[PDB]
Design an enzyme around this catalytic site. Structure first.
Site, PDB file in Angstrom:
ATOM      1  N   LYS A  78     -14.015  -0.265   4.334  1.00  0.00           N
ATOM      2  CA  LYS A  78     -14.480  -0.979   3.142  1.00  0.00           C
ATOM      3  C   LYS A  78     -15.565  -2.055   3.388  1.00  0.00           C
ATOM      4  O   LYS A  78     -16.626  -2.005   2.775  1.00  0.00           O
ATOM      5  CB  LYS A  78     -13.267  -1.586   2.409  1.00  0.00           C
ATOM      6  CG  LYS A  78     -12.226  -0.553   1.940  1.00  0.00           C
ATOM      7  CD  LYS A  78     -10.837  -0.367   2.696  1.00  0.00           C
ATOM      8  CE  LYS A  78      -9.658   0.632   1.846  1.00  0.00           C
ATOM      9  NZ  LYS A  78      -8.353   0.319   2.271  1.00  0.00           N
ATOM     10  N   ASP A 136      -2.267  -5.917   8.948  1.00  0.00           N
ATOM     11  CA  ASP A 136      -3.048  -4.778   8.486  1.00  0.00           C
ATOM     12  C   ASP A 136      -4.313  -5.398   7.896  1.00  0.00           C
ATOM     13  O   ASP A 136      -4.281  -5.985   6.811  1.00  0.00           O
ATOM     14  CB  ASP A 136      -2.273  -4.013   7.417  1.00  0.00           C
ATOM     15  CG  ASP A 136      -2.984  -2.758   6.961  1.00  0.00           C
ATOM     16  OD1 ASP A 136      -3.939  -2.303   7.626  1.00  0.00           O
ATOM     17  OD2 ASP A 136      -2.566  -2.217   5.927  1.00  0.00           O
ATOM     18  N   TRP A 170       0.854  -1.194   0.000  1.00  0.00           N
ATOM     19  CA  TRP A 170       0.000   0.000   0.000  1.00  0.00           C
ATOM     20  C   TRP A 170       0.886   1.238   0.000  1.00  0.00           C
ATOM     21  O   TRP A 170       1.782   1.363   0.827  1.00  0.00           O
ATOM     22  CB  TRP A 170      -0.900  -0.015   1.237  1.00  0.00           C
ATOM     23  CG  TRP A 170      -1.843   1.151   1.364  1.00  0.00           C
ATOM     24  CD1 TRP A 170      -2.514   1.789   0.357  1.00  0.00           C
ATOM     25  CD2 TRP A 170      -2.248   1.787   2.582  1.00  0.00           C
ATOM     26  NE1 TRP A 170      -3.312   2.779   0.874  1.00  0.00           N
ATOM     27  CE2 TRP A 170      -3.173   2.800   2.236  1.00  0.00           C
ATOM     28  CE3 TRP A 170      -1.924   1.598   3.932  1.00  0.00           C
ATOM     29  CZ2 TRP A 170      -3.779   3.623   3.196  1.00  0.00           C
ATOM     30  CZ3 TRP A 170      -2.527   2.417   4.886  1.00  0.00           C
ATOM     31  CH2 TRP A 170      -3.445   3.415   4.511  1.00  0.00           C
TER      32      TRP A 170
HETATM   33  C1  LIG Z   1      -7.692   0.767   3.431  1.00  0.00           C
HETATM   34  C2  LIG Z   1      -6.498   0.311   3.835  1.00  0.00           C
HETATM   35  C3  LIG Z   1      -5.913   0.713   5.056  1.00  0.00           C
HETATM   36  C4  LIG Z   1      -6.604   1.719   6.007  1.00  0.00           C
HETATM   37  O1  LIG Z   1      -7.679   2.467   5.524  1.00  0.00           O
HETATM   38  P1  LIG Z   1      -8.451   3.478   6.434  1.00  0.00           P
HETATM   39  O2  LIG Z   1      -9.555   4.052   5.453  1.00  0.00           O
HETATM   40  O3  LIG Z   1      -7.570   4.580   6.819  1.00  0.00           O
HETATM   41  O4  LIG Z   1      -9.011   2.629   7.489  1.00  0.00           O
HETATM   42  C5  LIG Z   1      -4.708   0.250   5.460  1.00  0.00           C
HETATM   43  N1  LIG Z   1      -4.019  -0.622   4.688  1.00  0.00           N
HETATM   44  C6  LIG Z   1      -4.497  -1.054   3.506  1.00  0.00           C
HETATM   45  C7  LIG Z   1      -3.653  -2.053   2.695  1.00  0.00           C
HETATM   46  C8  LIG Z   1      -5.739  -0.605   3.053  1.00  0.00           C
HETATM   47  O5  LIG Z   1      -6.201  -1.014   1.866  1.00  0.00           O
END
Ligand SMILES: *Cc1c(COP(=O)(O)O)cnc(C)c1O
Ligand SMILES: *Cc1c(COP(=O)(O)O)cnc(C)c1O
Lengths: 412, 412
Positions: B254, B215, B134
């Protein structure tokens, strides 16, 4: 790695949020909460402002209602309109496009962005706080490694504001130092400098090239007027314009009653420079990065409520009335509490309760008296003597007045 | 002090939220958005979950509904229930009272708490991220002064998992290193280790006394089954109970569609030891200080919705169906694209689009091919070739199929 956390020490509970917890677990029917400064109505319950009830109804009737991500810098409707109520409609800083506004996690988030910004670019600058300032101020700056100093504010002797101690600290301070000032309604004291004193205070800051940071958490609670309560901030914006950058940490936790929704804005009135064209998007980019790295983006629902409140002329009007409603009930209780003590014949003078403004009253009760109020009378105050007037209502003012009386006489 | 910001660098926009801006500032009526991984329905519009709608209704129909401050560590209703969906109700970490759970500003906030906690207590530990990972990962840790390293993950040649290089990095890393693992639905590749591969990865981490940080931003999107998707985390907490503390960054952005409400939790499964009676409270008070001095307390509204979802049986049964509905449409769009490219006779093989899981597809397209897609076809993808399948629907899959067929022939 199996005994990695074995040496980590226990920190004590938060000074303010701890009293909330003790109050909650207290099973006595006589408990009274005068700790955290949260507005309570005539029945002692939380009060959702009518203006926000109306605004929340509009938000939900909108066909485009969703919980989608906001921009990294937050909702533009919120930031743009928020800066207008702080800086003013006929603001030179605004007209000249010298104001950087970003949405933050209420007033604490705005103060954290400032601390994080300082710790990355000017780590050496000392952060001056008021002798008896907000309980979380020190931690916010020290959580980022910055060194904090203190300037005289409250004179216990005369219950007044030590103006000579304040002005002296601004002189005997390193040029370019950061001074954190309470825009109005000083949390804990509730004693603000007059319009005249603010001039001296700001002229002193201007002569030493110090950076002013206005912690704005109670605009609307000092006099009940938004413009009157922004006098200190606007005064600094005109005078520090060619001296230093102005930082404004705005919170809607109290005036809009948003509390737990975490709605606030971080403002920055840049100085008059010819190269401001590049500086503006340069600094803004630094801020966006701090926000993205720690929170990603700010909470939407609360920001959407305040934006509509600021956008819609009838809700903006109703909000003004909701603030007079709150600030007036607090005044009625300041009087009710003072008169009850006068009638009880409580030793000493208590006019400072009515003379102080804002949400609190720095009572002048010793930690010993405060401890007995809790353990013996179930009345909850901050160990410093600070009491949230909004916790008082017609149904408990006398019980609290009698408890204070008892503890003052008990230690006499 | 007037020229303090006359030397501050200008930073480039977010690699992800930037696509959202450039796409938004596009006038073309025939534009497709495959940038940020935010779910969209068949009409290409934001989709508030039917279960979320019902929970949000009950909260406003509550007489006691308010915007008051929550505790520093959040809504206990949220944190307890959230721990149960990832860890499992029959978890040994839960029955043994070994899991610390606090509310956080979604997954980014939880990852930030981790970084600051490490930065504060174990500064020299290295944080290992996957290659690729990410886009915001690195900045969260580097913002806290933590040094980052990487581990082989995606092999572009085989378009598969480089398990031996992944395992070699684990073995070669200095003992006690922090490995940021993607629980499921890997971002950006969409490639996850099979159950058998996870066993090897976890065993290797256990052997080296490494710290596992899961995560978890997509639980429920990989297989559309919550339990099935929590496999790696549950395996980790089981095997590492005697070796190292397990960190869990959970997001409801999500799977619950909370996105902008910033709802998440930071979980911490402590190791097995009798000193936990004091370790748990000591570490918990440490985490609370970090929150209090940065954001004070977390967003109230989003926590209440998700909390209501998790604790109301019919609402949670509906949430499970909503997640299937979402993941089901994604898988539908993966086949529609692959099948469209086959029919067009697009050079190369494209089964990788259907082999991947989650809501992204590492298409394999080159940066220039990607650049030509919006520069000629108004199709927005992430520079790395990442495309969010959610942006595709029956009204545009045919169009994106043709736009891709064109770019593949143009360059290659
Ligand atoms: C979405 C996501 C997050 C955190 O998203 P938040 O909208 O800030 O909760 C962290 N790591 C990955 C790989 C993600 O796709
Ligand atoms: C309430 C308050 C703040 C900030 O509060 P937030 O709820 O974090 O916006 C800052 N300073 C003072 C003096 C306050 O009373």
């Amino acid at each position: 790695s199996a005994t990695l956390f074995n040496n980590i020490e226990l920190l004590p509970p938060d000074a303010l949020f701890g009293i909330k917890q003790r109050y909650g677990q207290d099973q006595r029917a006589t408990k009274v909460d005068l700790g955290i400064g949260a507005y309570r109505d005539d029945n002692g319950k939380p009060w959702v402002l009518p203006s926000v009830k109306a605004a929340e109804k509009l938000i939900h009737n909108d066909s485009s209602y969703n919980h989608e991500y906001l921009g990294i810098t937050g909702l533009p409707s919120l930031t743009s309109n928020a800066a207008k109520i702080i800086f003013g409609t006929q603001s030179d800083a605004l007209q000249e496009d010298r104001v950087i506004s970003v949405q933050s996690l209420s007033g604490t988030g705005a103060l954290h962005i400032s601390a994080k910004f300082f710790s990355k670019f000017f780590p050496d600058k000392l952060v001056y706080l008021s002798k008896p300032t907000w309980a979380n101020h020190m931690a916010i700056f020290e959580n980022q490694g910055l060194k904090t100093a203190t300037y005289p504010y409250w004179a216990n002797e005369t219950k007044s504001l030590d103006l000579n101690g304040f002005l002296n600290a601004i002189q005997k301070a390193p040029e370019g130092s950061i001074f954190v000032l309470h825009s109005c309604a000083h949390n804990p004291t509730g004693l603000d400098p007059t319009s005249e004193q603010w001039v001296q205070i700001v002229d002193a800051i201007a002569s030493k090239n110090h950076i002013a940071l206005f912690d704005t958490a109670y605009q609307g609670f000092a006099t009940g007027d938004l413009d009157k309560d922004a006098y200190a901030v606007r005064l600094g914006v005109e005078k520090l314009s060619t001296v230093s950058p102005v930082f404004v940490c705005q919170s809607f936790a109290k005036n809009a009653g948003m509390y737990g929704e975490r709605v606030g804005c971080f403002h920055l009135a840049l100085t008059k420079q010819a190269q401001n064209k590049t500086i503006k998007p340069a600094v803004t980019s630094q801020l966006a990065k701090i926000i993205r790295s720690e929170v990603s983006n700010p909470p939407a629902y609360g920001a959407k409520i305040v934006a509509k409140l600021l956008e819609t002329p009838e809700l903006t009007e109703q909000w003004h009335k909701d603030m007079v409603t709150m600030s007036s009930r607090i005044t009625k209780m300041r009087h009710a509490l003072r008169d009850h003590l006068v009638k009880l014949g409580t030793p000493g003078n208590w006019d400072h309760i009515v003379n102080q403004c804002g949400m609190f009253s720095f009572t002048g009760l010793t930690p010993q008296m405060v401890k007995r109020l809790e353990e013996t009378h179930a009345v909850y105050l901050v160990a410093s003597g600070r009491a949230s007037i909004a916790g008082l209502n017609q149904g408990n003012v006398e019980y609290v007045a009698k408890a204070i009386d008892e503890v003052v006489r008990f230690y006499a």
